[PDB]
Design a binder for this molecule. Structure first.
Ligand SMILES: NC(=O)C1=CN([C@@H]2O[C@H](COP(=O)(O)OP(=O)(O)OC[C@H]3O[C@@H](n4cnc5c(N)ncnc54)[C@H](OP(=O)(O)O)[C@@H]3O)[C@@H](O)[C@H]2O)C=CC1
Ligand SMILES: CCCCCCCCCCC[C@H](O)CC(=O)SCCNC(=O)CCNC(=O)[C@H](O)C(C)(C)COP(=O)(O)O
Ligand SMILES: [Zn+2]
Lengths: 115, 96, 87, 209, 146, 342, 145, 129
């Protein structure tokens, strides 16, 4: 009941190990994306975005979930390596054309009827 | 009949005409507001009301399969003329 | 001036924890309203509610006070300091 | 004929398929949970998810089964079930010209042994179930998106996923690029609520609960 | 047949009084700034709110808190209910305590100064339903009505 | 607001914004970019044009279907301007030309045409008119471009008192004729700076910054009547600016001092061409004026937009000019040109 | 004339005459620039400086629970008690009844229709009061279709 | 059951990061578990036997060109079905969506009798057929 099958890791520490090596691969990769993909964002401007993507889902605690996003990040790295993603596909991570959205309640009330 | 709004825009049979202070009229300049001159509201009016000599009458719209589903109109009220709900043709009892 | 703007007693109908509060509102309330016939003492009850006392002061300030498992005398005492602690 | 519109019913095929269903149930009682033959003579075997590799192999190698062609491998998502994902294997036996269905269940975060070793045709199919639904297949030679665009976020065929998605594409001249933006349809999909409030088939009437 | 009422004579954009006292359309910022300034300047008992009839409960508590923070306890309502004695203090003083569904159980009903046919049509329907089967006896103290 | 100008949606393509606008001269540089932003938020643009409609093709795919509408207009025809600005909230004037054509001098495209636009916009009943000038606009500047821009500013202010006047300093972008100009100067031997270009200070502003500033000024309810000055964040010495331009392009740099009158003769010789005049006397002059600092005038930061330094957005402009050799070098390879402090 | 939202254009709590507190859900968004009422009040409080604590609909419902816990028990009749105390407090004023008869404000069908703002602004209730007032001649139409 | 070093994962299941749903559309929405009410136009109850989960209605504006019902809420026409309330709330918590479940209303069993139409002492006697 409370105990179920594992995906890859058998504890949170091994999942964190996999997250660590995935971050290793991404951090090593980033300048290769900047050069090969002819990107115009600075190298650090991609490494911090990798950091932010890792920090986004930093709240999850179910191990199987952690292995799942480890595989998904591995797949995205796989696409980025052998030029399977393109310039537009990579640039989607930096939401450029999107106008900045407001966070305070007052501006949301001024702009439209949404939560 | 198609008539002209004060702005200059022709009103359609649905009574549609953009307001003077409406930016949408920009789409119609150097073009024309596509409207249908043959108004169904008028065109059905002058069709003569048939003097049917029976209490009820069946209308199919003419042409059998070419027309509308056949419906039966009850011509009993002398104050009004039975009108088919599909094609708008009227019928009336011969002065009852 | 915190002239004791409003009292809100939120007691449960059936649970024993609010039992004492019930006793208070059964007996020691008519004379309470007779004492100060301007106070909006609110006795809005609800099912499955821990008995509590809210004392809305002036300028929109509130201090909730729990009345869990209190006695009738206990609730009386815990309210008299509230309406006597204001000038 | 007395039934010019009703589709003819074959009962000999029903008996043969029922006999083979009992055969398979007796052969592998460890995994075969429930076997049933539909009214139109199609046999379905519901097995435990651990029996994916064994049962298939049996159906592929036994002299009396000889199912040597994975016709189709798909999944059906039923959110109201605990293990919503329901993986379906369709197999065809060319020697006994017969089609079989092996159906297993799996939730979002439970892996399934890849049947690539048994049926090498499954290799692409599995990826599709991963891409469309999100069922992860362990021991797979290469699991990747096969249909969705690169960098896609989500599993489209899941029921809890809008048919219009969340992101549309556009070309922006400011960045000179095919950018992605939040979806915004000119005309929203008009959801039609077409369902007769009168019970259709008395045969499939769920008992009250 | 009142949904059409929510298609005519609607207020869509904020209005403010111009130099002739004429109502004119304005952005939310300007009207909110005017109201905020007037609330900031005038405080105490000179601030008040007469709640309507179709208002919700969230807006009522929001207005109550807003006017309380300016020390204004003059929250009034269009309807008048006797505040003498217990008043709003006891809930049962202003509640149909035995519910609408309880009407189908009572045997004698005494309506005082009311026309439930129009004031509460569903309540009158419930009274009639109890009148049919349970043979409940009604008695009116108000003016004779249908 | 009218019943159809009430803002609706979430800022996407198919969202009613209420910024129904006319952008004269949209077919070029910022005229494109502004439309893009106007197209992005969902505003009905009444883009007028005089060129071949094919040249307006790149204007088509930045607005939701039905939003962008193209109309024929002529500068010397009040009826055309009245037709294009009859139903519009804002009229943005972007008409300009770095040279003087046979049928249009500097005064025609910077005084006469802006005068007609402002007068017709006021007659029609528009609420905002954003006119665009140059930061180095002076009635006594030797270049007729800046002098005509100054008199045009005065005329536009007279005709439309509440017209927002924006004075960008120097637009650099993918098609800018300012960085591409210096990059293309490699063909004619070396780069011939006047007095080695060690006395001119230039403050270039990013194109996206200017277009976003225009959009914000439209949305800002206080931009009426004001006169903004859109400048970059740093002030570059002209020699150092060309150094940076040729370093990012990795082309060899061959500075060469050149007497002023000889460069005027070169500008005349290039003006002779019956096609796109690569360089004019006005052009060789303007590259030698410094950017007049005007701290009193409000800037981009007041509108809420942070100027992007040229270093970050220089690789976009000059990556095309690089040969196959340095075609893939990163953005941080070349160190920012030293800037004189503001 | 800060425009508010209507009952069909908001998710809000209404209490019937029996004490049951139900909630209406959003079906259409407010027309034009109109917004939710609680949002309007909260934004006004923020502008004026005395910002209210609640910033979301769930927060406002929590505040409603704080003021009255029976305003969140949706579709639950919370029976009140203590009729004796209310009666005892009532027998102190000794206010004297008048001689004017108890005449309900609405005594005919004509008064039922146009009561509230929405009903008054509507047109079908106008046709209804017309039908009931003069007679049967105001409701003739071609109902054949 | 599953002999692969079967691990205890007691903490509650959450796939909010494995669905691709953006930031906005995962807490600011409020799903609604409810048994659909019978269409009072009809008299059939076959549509009131399955629980349904739906998302709050958002802005729906008019397209300037033709007048369509333009919207920017992807989860507007998506309504899930569920056999039981518990399964629906399990799905809601699993995907991290705020809910407000309404209990299933059931028609109270009435007491019909043809004879009461022609009663002798009671008021249920009908005046017409
Ligand atoms: N660094 C800069 O370039 C700066 C420019 N500005 C001002 O910005 C404005 C636009 O600049 P930019 O976009 O780079 O200029 P471009 O030369 O790239 O585009 C100018 C636009 O004006 C139109 N135009 C010119 N003359 C006429 C005419 N006689 N009749 C009708 N249309 C005409 C052009 O039409 P067509 O394409 O068919 O020729 C084109 O749409 C100008 O006023 C310019 O002076 C301000 C500050 C700095
Ligand atoms: C942009 C261009 C390049 C292309 C795009 C580059 C970005 C692609 C990112 C792909 C990977 C994916 O987003 C994230 C993943 O799979 S897993 C993230 C870490 N989340 C967890 O592991 C859960 C619990 N979290 C923690 O335990 C702590 O966060 C931490 C791990 C830091 C330990 O901290 P402690 O030790 O203090
Ligand atoms: Zn007919």
């Amino acid at each position: 009941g409370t105990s179920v099958k594992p995906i890859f890791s058998r504890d949170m520490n091994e999942a964190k190990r996999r997250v660590r090596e995935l971050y290793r691969a991404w951090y090593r990769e980033v300048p290769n994306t900047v050069h090969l993909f002819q990107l115009d964002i600075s190298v650090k401007q991609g490494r911090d975005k990798v950091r932010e993507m890792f920090m986004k889902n930093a709240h999850v605690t179910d191990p199987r979930v952690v292995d799942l996003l480890v595989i998904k990040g591995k797949m995205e790295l796989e696409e980025t390596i052998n030029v399977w993603k393109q310039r537009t596909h990579i640039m989607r991570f930096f939401h450029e054309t999107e106008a900045p959205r407001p966070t305070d309640f007052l501006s949301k009330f001024y702009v439209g009827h949404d939560p | 009949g198609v008539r002209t709004s004060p702005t200059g825009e022709k009103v359609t049979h649905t009574g549609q005409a953009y307001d003077d202070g409406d930016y949408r009229r920009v789409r119609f300049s150097d073009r024309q507001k596509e409207v249908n001159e043959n108004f169904a509201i008028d065109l059905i009016a002058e069709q003569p009301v048939s003097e049917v000599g029976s209490r009820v009458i069946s209308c199919d719209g003419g042409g059998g399969a070419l027309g509308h589903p056949r419906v039966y109109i009850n011509l009993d009220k002398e104050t009004k003329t039975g009108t088919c709900g599909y094609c708008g043709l009227q019928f009336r009892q011969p002065h009852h | 001036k915190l002239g004791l703007r409003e009292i809100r007693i939120h007691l449960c109908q059936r649970s024993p924890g609010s039992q004492g509060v019930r006793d208070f509102i059964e007996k020691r309330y008519v004379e309470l309203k007779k004492a100060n016939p301007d106070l909006p003492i609110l006795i809005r009850e609800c099912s499955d509610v821990q008995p509590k006392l809210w004392a809305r002061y002036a300028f929109g300030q509130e201090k909730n006070v729990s009345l869990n498992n209190f006695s009738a005398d206990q609730v009386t005492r815990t309210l008299e300091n509230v309406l006597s602690g204001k000038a | 004929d007395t039934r010019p519109t009703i589709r003819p019913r074959n009962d000999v095929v029903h008996k043969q398929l029922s006999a083979f269903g009992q055969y398979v149930a007796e052969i592998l009682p460890k995994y075969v949970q429930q076997v049933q033959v539909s009214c139109f003579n199609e046999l379905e075997i519901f097995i435990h998810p651990d029996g994916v590799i064994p049962v298939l192999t049996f159906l592929r190698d036994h002299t009396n089964a000889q199912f040597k062609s994975l016709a189709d491998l798909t999944a059906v998502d039923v959110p109201t079930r605990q293990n919503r994902f329901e993986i379906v294997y369709n197999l065809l036996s060319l020697r006994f010209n017969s089609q079989i269905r092996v159906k297993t269940y799996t939730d979002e975060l439970t892996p399934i042994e890849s049947s690539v070793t048994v049926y090498k045709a499954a290799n692409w199919y599995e990826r599709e179930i991963w891409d469309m639904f999100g069922v992860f297949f362990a021991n797979h030679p290469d699991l990747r998106r096969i249909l969705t665009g690169y960098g896609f976020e989500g599993h489209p065929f899941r029921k809890d996923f809008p048919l219009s998605g969340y992101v549309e594409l556009r070309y922006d001249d400011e960045v000179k690029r095919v950018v992605a933006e939040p979806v915004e349809l000119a005309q929203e999909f008009r959801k039609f609520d077409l369902n007769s409030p009168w019970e259709a088939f008395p045969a499939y009437r769920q008992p009250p609960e | 047949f009142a949904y059409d009422g929510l298609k005519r004579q609607r207020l869509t954009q904020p209005m403010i009084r111009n130099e002739k006292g004429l109502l004119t359309y304005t952005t939310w910022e300007d009207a909110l700034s005017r109201v905020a300034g007037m609330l900031q300047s005038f405080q105490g008992n000179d601030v008040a709110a007469i709640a309507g009839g179709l208002v919700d409960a969230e807006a009522l508590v929001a207005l109550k808190d807003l006017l309380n923070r300016v020390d204004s306890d003059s929250l009034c309502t269009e309807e008048v209910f006797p505040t003498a004695g217990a008043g709003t203090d006891l809930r049962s003083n202003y509640l149909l305590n035995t519910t609408i569904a309880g009407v189908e159980e009572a045997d004698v009903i005494l309506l005082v100064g009311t026309n439930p046919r129009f004031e509460a049509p569903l309540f009158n329907a419930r009274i009639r339903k109890s009148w049919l089967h349970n043979d409940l006896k009604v008695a009116l103290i108000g003016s004779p009505v249908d | 607001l009218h019943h159809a100008l009430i803002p609706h949606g979430k800022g996407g393509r198919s969202s009613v914004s209420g910024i129904v606008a006319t952008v004269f001269g949209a077919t070029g540089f910022l005229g494109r970019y502004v439309v893009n932003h106007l197209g992005r938020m969902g505003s009905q643009v009444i883009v007028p044009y005089r060129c071949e409609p094919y040249d307006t093709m790149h204007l088509r795919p930045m607005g939701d279907l039905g939003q962008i509408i193209f109309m024929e207009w002529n500068g010397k025809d009040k009826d055309s301007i009245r037709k294009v600005v009859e139903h519009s909230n804002v009229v943005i004037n972007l008409v300009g030309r770095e040279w003087e054509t046979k049928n249009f001098d500097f005064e025609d495209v910077f005084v006469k045409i802006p005068h007609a636009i402002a007068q017709v916009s006021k007659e029609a009943g528009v609420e905002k008119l954003i006119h665009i000038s140059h930061l180095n606009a002076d009635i006594k500047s030797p270049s007729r471009y800046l002098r005509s821009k100054a008199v045009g500013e005065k005329e536009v202010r007279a005709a439309f008192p509440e017209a927002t006047i924006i004075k960008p300093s120097d637009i650099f972008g993918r098609e800018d004729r300012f960085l591409n100009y210096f990059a293309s100067m490699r063909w004619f031997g070396g780069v011939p700076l006047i007095s080695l270009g060690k006395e001119t200070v230039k403050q270039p502003v990013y194109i996206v910054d200017v277009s976003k500033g225009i959009i914000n000024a439209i949305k800002d309810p206080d931009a009426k009547g004001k006169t903004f000055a859109f400048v970059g964040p740093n002030r570059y010495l002209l020699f150092d600016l060309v150094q940076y331009i040729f370093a990012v392009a990795y082309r060899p740099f061959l500075p060469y001092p050149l007497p002023h009158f000889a460069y005027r003769w070169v500008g005349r010789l290039f003006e002779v061409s019956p096609f796109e005049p690569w360089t004019t006397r006005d052009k060789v002059e303007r590259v030698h004026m410094s950017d007049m600092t005007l701290p009193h005038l409000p800037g981009l930061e007041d509108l809420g937009i942070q100027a992007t330094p040229l270093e970050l957005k220089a690789i976009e402009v000059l990556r095309r000019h690089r040969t196959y050799r340095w075609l893939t070098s990163e953005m941080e390879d070349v160190k920012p040109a030293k800037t004189v402090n503001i | 004339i800060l425009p508010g939202a209507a009952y069909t254009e908001k998710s809000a709590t209404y209490v019937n005459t029996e004490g049951r507190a139900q909630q209406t859900k959003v079906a259409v968004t407010p027309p034009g620039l109109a917004r939710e009422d609680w949002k309007i009040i909260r934004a006004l409080s923020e502008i004026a400086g005395m910002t209210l604590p609640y910033d979301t609909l769930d927060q406002v419902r929590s505040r409603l629970e704080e003021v009255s816990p029976n305003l969140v028990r949706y579709d639950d009749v919370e029976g009140a008690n203590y009729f004796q105390q209310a009666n005892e407090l009532s027998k102190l004023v000794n206010q004297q009844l008048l001689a004017d008869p108890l005449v309900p404000p609405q005594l005919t069908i004509k008064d039922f229709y146009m009561t509230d703002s929405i009903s008054r602004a509507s047109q079908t209730m106008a046709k209804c009061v017309k039908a009931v007032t003069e007679g049967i001649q105001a409701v003739e139409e071609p109902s054949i279709c | 059951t599953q002999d692969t070093q079967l691990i205890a994962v007691d903490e509650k299941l959450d796939i909010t990061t494995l669905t691709g749903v953006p930031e906005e559309h995962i807490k600011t929405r409020k799903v609604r578990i409810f048994v659909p009410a019978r269409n009072n136009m009809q008299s059939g109850v076959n549509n009131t036997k399955k629980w349904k989960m739906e998302f709050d209605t958002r802005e729906r504006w008019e397209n300037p060109l033709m007048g369509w019902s333009s919207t920017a809420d992807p989860l507007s026409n998506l309504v899930l079905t569920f056999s039981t309330k518990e399964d629906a709330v399990a799905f809601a918590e699993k995907n991290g969506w705020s809910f407000d479940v309404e209990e299933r209303k059931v028609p109270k069993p009435k007491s019909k009798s043809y004879g009461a139409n022609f009663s002798w002492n009671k008021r249920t006697r009908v005046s017409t057929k």
